[PDB]
Design a protein around this ligand. Structure first.
Ligand code: CA
Ligand code: ZN
Lengths: 610, 155
């Protein structure tokens, strides 16, 4: 039978009708033996009423290919931290049995990914960018920027890998191409025209990373960014019609890394000398406008950048402040520390980048010949020259952690006596801590940790845990007092934790002024014994500037730096599984894997119909 | 061209070679034109050096099938050091990916595996064992062997 012979014997038997098919396809069908015998087999199948087999063959010899799409295959591979050899073993195996190869080989992905990396998509700017080599195809670049290796000068030892911002942005945007065209079509706005008024608000966020087990000290700093929102201004006569706003930017699944430096957070010299080009091109970016191939068309773009996702220490360090708990605390209102205890709510937000440059020029020139402290005051405490511009806002996460640790301390205090004990000792402090921890273990099932993170904070803020704490206060008046305090705090908290309180929870905003006011008054009254003049910063911000920014900057919690810091665990595990392994490359490939993990396209392939 | 037409037109245009292959099959292959055009498409794809699509087709036509045996998947899991969670992750992935339950999920893999561990097959010893419990189906034991935990004695 024809099915059991070898291919050599089957050709020896069928060559005659073969060459008849050849001559027929040449006579009538342009010499396409392939498609001719394809349709012949299709119709011979469809004649017998074998509709499923013929439909599947039509689905195979068109559109979809071999059993899986190579893109989604690579999506899996990166989504679960497998190695090359890992993947090859898996693939070879599943192809051996019942294969019918399904996964795709390694080599094919090794260049299939080049769509999702930077340096693939054509684009330009009008006007052309300042100080940037306009080659649009370069991918991963060492961040040193050609530091002359001369050991005579300052040594060029610090290892780094990064991108060119523009290439990163065009990759991320042209990745979003799908979603932005979808949103353009949903709003039924025209597709041929309106190709010039797109505006993109992009969030940037950077943070160091402590105690990175090294395989230079143990540190490293990662600088990332995340697309937040995009609207359209064309044709004008209006504001920007919101096209697409991101639906959950907090989750690190949208935190696109752009630079990594095996360096410490604090040593200004190295951090600056590597961040330089990044800052320069972000600055030049506000000027020109972008042109990309999108929807098959050349369309323009403008941008609005926001530096929000930085923890306090870095913000104050890079905006030329006295880091950190010095006589000037607020990054916005320039009142002193002790003054911040007298008044708490009434303040204006003034601190701005350019005016800080003005105040620093005043610090340098000293045009009034004042002394140390008089000049310190005249500039309201601006010593160092800032260089990275930053948006006037606070962080969401670590304000949460600060309020959490503040309530932690005050709970350790009120378990014992404080208004009754003017100066306690260390032993009693640790003892009140110990009974608080035993209480959190017996009730609420909470063992302590070294320091309270976000989850432990969410838990400690809960009301009935405050009840299990207050159970031990001897004076019931103080008990009901801090309970009322806790209730006010809880009615005021999701103000900033939200994504959009004007939409989610407008009622707390509508009653925020009076709420925070009565809060601060209860504080100053029943807790003056402790807060005469010493206030932490986050407490200041949450009671002096919340409504200002929330009304002005649209939303808060929507700009939480947390989105990056958490996600740093990835840089942890990526380090284990997909090390090169050698630092000079280790970074490069880590970042490649990371950016690959974080692009939308692959997350769209991963979610996969809920 | 042929591939852009409907069934009516392509029949109208190919009728001649359709009769040619029909009569060639009746003379040589018993008039079973379906297997003849199957083999001819296979050979034309073999010549075109696109072996992959032709092999996938033969997987469709009397092919081994889509299902993967649960044991082999348990293997490819352990042999590759993958997780429990990650396995389920990529599983739900391929599940919603192409229309089929290609891998088995976790719990069925666990069940299928529990026989491959020790303590599943019944047996005997002749004579019975020396000072050994005749219990058989047991699996993993703790090695201390009932080491009385009282602090007074050796830890
Ligand atoms: Ca941090
Ligand atoms: Zn302030």
């Amino acid at each position: 039978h024809l099915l059991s012979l070898t291919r050599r014997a089957q050709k020896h038997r069928l060559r005659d009708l073969k060459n008849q098919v050849k001559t027929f396809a040449e006579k009538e069908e342009g010499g396409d033996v392939k498609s001719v015998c394809l349709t012949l087999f299709l119709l011979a199948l469809r004649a017998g009423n074998e509709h499923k087999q013929a439909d599947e063959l039509e689905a195979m010899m068109q559109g979809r290919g071999f059993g899986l799409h190579p893109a989604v295959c690579l999506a899996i591979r990166v989504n679960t931290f497998l190695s090359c050899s890992q993947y090859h073993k898996m693939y070879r195996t599943v192809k051996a049995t019942s294969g019918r190869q399904i996964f795709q080989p390694l080599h094919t992905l090794r260049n299939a990914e080049k769509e999702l990396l930077p340096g693939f998509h054509q684009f330009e700017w009008q006007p052309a960018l300042k100080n940037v080599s306009t080659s649009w195809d370069v991918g991963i670049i060492d961040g040193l920027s050609g530091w002359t290796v001369s050991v005579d000068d300052v040594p060029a030892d610090t290892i780094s890998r990064r991108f060119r911002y523009d290439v990163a942005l065009v990759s991320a945007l042209k990745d979003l191409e799908e979603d932005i065209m979808e949103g353009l079509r949903e709003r039924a706005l025209d597709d041929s025209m309106c190709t010039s008024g797109f505006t993109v608000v992009v969030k940037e966020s950077c943070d160091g990373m402590g105690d990175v087990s090294e395989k230079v000290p143990e540190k490293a700093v990662r600088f990332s960014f995340t697309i937040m929102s995009i609207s359209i201004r064309l044709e004008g006569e209006d504001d920007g019609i919101t096209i697409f706003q991101e639906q959950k930017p907090n989750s690190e699944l949208s935190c696109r890394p752009l630079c990594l430096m095996f360096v410490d957070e604090s040593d200004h010299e190295t951090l600056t000398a590597i961040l330089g080009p990044v800052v320069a091109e972000r600055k030049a970016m506000m000027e020109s406008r972008l042109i990309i191939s999108v929807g098959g068309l050349l369309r323009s773009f403008r941008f609005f950048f926001r530096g929000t996702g930085y923890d306090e220490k870095m913000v104050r360090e890079m905006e030329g402040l006295e880091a950190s708990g010095s006589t000037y605390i607020c990054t916005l209102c320039d009142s002193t520390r002790a003054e911040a205890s007298q008044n708490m709510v009434l303040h204006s937000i003034t601190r701005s980048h350019d005016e800080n440059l003005e105040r620093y020029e005043i610090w340098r020139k000293n045009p009034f010949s004042e002394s140390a402290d008089e000049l310190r005051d005249r500039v309201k405490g601006v010593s160092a020259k800032p260089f990275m511009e930053t948006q006037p806002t606070l962080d969401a996460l670590h304000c949460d952690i600060g309020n959490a640790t503040e309530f932690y301390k005050i709970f350790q205090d009120e378990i014992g006596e404080v208004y009754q004990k003017p100066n306690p000792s260390r032993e009693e402090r640790r003892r009140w801590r110990s009974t608080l921890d035993k209480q959190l273990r017996k009730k609420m099932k909470l063992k302590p940790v070294m320091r309270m993170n976000g989850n432990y904070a969410r838990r400690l803020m809960t009301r009935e845990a405050v009840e299990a704490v207050c159970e031990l206060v001897p004076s019931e008046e103080r008990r009901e007092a801090l309970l009322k305090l806790m209730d006010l705090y809880l009615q005021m908290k999701p103000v900033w934790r939200s994504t959009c309180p004007s939409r989610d929870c407008p009622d707390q905003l509508c009653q925020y002024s009076y709420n925070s006011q009565q809060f601060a008054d209860l504080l100053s009254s029943m807790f003056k014994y402790r807060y005469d003049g010493k206030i932490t910063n986050y407490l200041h911000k949450t009671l002096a500037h919340v409504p200002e920014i929330v009304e002005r900057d649209g939303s808060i919690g929507a700009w939480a730096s947390e989105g990056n810091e958490s996600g740093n665990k990835l840089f942890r595990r990526f380090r284990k599984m997909n090390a090169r392994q050698s630092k000079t490359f280790e970074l490069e490939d880590i970042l490649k894997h990371h950016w690959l993990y974080t692009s939308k396209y692959l997350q769209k392939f991963m979610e996969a119909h809920k």
